[PDB]
């Protein structure tokens, strides 16, 4: 029941940081598994 304030920005910050965290998970798995 609440419009997201211009905290769309924080949300964008967090998603980009979670993507980055995924990329690490990716090549970390991909390395040792190869």
């Amino acid at each position: 029941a609440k419009l997201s304030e211009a905290e769309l920005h924080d949300k964008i910050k967090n998603l980009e940081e979670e993507k980055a965290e995924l990329f690490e998970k990716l090549d970390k798995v991909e390395e040792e598994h190869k």
Binding site: E7, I12, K13, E17, K19, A20, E24
Partner: protein, 125 residues
């Protein structure tokens, strides 16, 4: 067919300070990591020497972004572009007040991440 030393990148630096032998076997891959102020945005963080003796790579880092610094009591915090590394926000005070402190602040490198250059000012009187 082979490569000379790699271009310096504005957003990333090579892992491992190695003697950087001024020449590199075609097909060599070098591992990079994001500079402070930057976060990873691609799975492959490498430059590779291609068949034409040239280093190839994509932009695998983007700007980090600062926390929104919150509200300015009796004032306003104005986003001008975004809250990314390098960007600036502006501060202002409502009709009955004087701004004490800085009118701007900038998302900059702090610790091992990113943060605001100047503290929020106060709106007073």
């Amino acid at each position: 067919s082979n490569c000379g030393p790699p271009p310096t990148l504005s957003f990333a630096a090579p892992m491992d300070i190695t003697l950087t032998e001024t020449r590199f076997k075609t097909g060599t891959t070098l591992k990079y990591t994001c500079l402070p102020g930057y976060v990873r945005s691609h799975s492959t963080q490498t430059l590779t020497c291609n068949s034409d003796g040239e280093w190839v790579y994509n932009t695998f880092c983007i700007y980090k972004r600062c926390r929104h610094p919150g509200e300015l009591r009796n004032g306003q915090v104005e986003i001008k572009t975004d809250l990314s590394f390098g960007s600036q926000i502006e501060f202002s005070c409502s009709e009955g007040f004087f701004l004490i402190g800085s009118t701007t602040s900038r998302c900059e490198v702090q610790d091992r991440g990113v943060g605001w250059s100047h503290p929020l000012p106060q709106c007073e009187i």
